[model samples]
Target: MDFNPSEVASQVTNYIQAIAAAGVGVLALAIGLSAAWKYAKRFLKG
Candidate 1:
């Protein structure tokens, strides 16, 4: 078996970037849904 530090480091960085992007996407979706829910409630009550 052969091990390469550079390859491992690149993979780690890519994984980190993917995780960060996913987090941002999830956060945006949550905020949008929350806003929609709040507005929907107001409309429904009226």
Candidate 2:
């Protein structure tokens, strides 16, 4: 109903958390895929 500073602050904090969670998810996926690909290459070579 009215402008609330604390509400805005909490929203911003949650937004940052959401971004961080997504970033970590993407990072984990990238690392896992790279590892799998490297292993596959070795497997095929051997």
Candidate 3:
């Protein structure tokens, strides 16, 4: 099999974009959960 450098580069770019998107989604979910947990704690304590 043969591969072109530009083609490989484009594929890598696509993978990087996908990974970045997934990472952002996970970060947002974690932050949201943390905020919800804090709110729950405060409500329960009060």
lDDT of each: 0.82, 0.83, 0.82
The alpha-carbon RMSD values of the candidates against the true structure, listed in the order shown, are 3.9, 4.0, 3.6
- Candidate 2 lDDT over 1-46, as tens digits, reads 5677788878778887878888999978889788888878878865
Clash number for candidate 1: 0
TM-score of 1: 0.48
In candidate 3, what residue range of length 10 has the lowest lDDT sum? Answer: 1-10
Quick one: best TM-score, which candidate? 3
Q: Residue by residue across 1-46, what tens digits does model 3's lDDT show?
A: 4676787888777987878888899879889788888888879865
Cα error of candidate 3 at position 3, Å: 12
Badly placed stretches (over 4 Å) of model 2 are 1-11, 44-46
> Clashing pairs in model 3?
none
lDDT of 2 at 33: 86
Instruction: Give the poorly placed runs of model 3, Cα more than 4 Å off.
Output: 1-8, 44-46
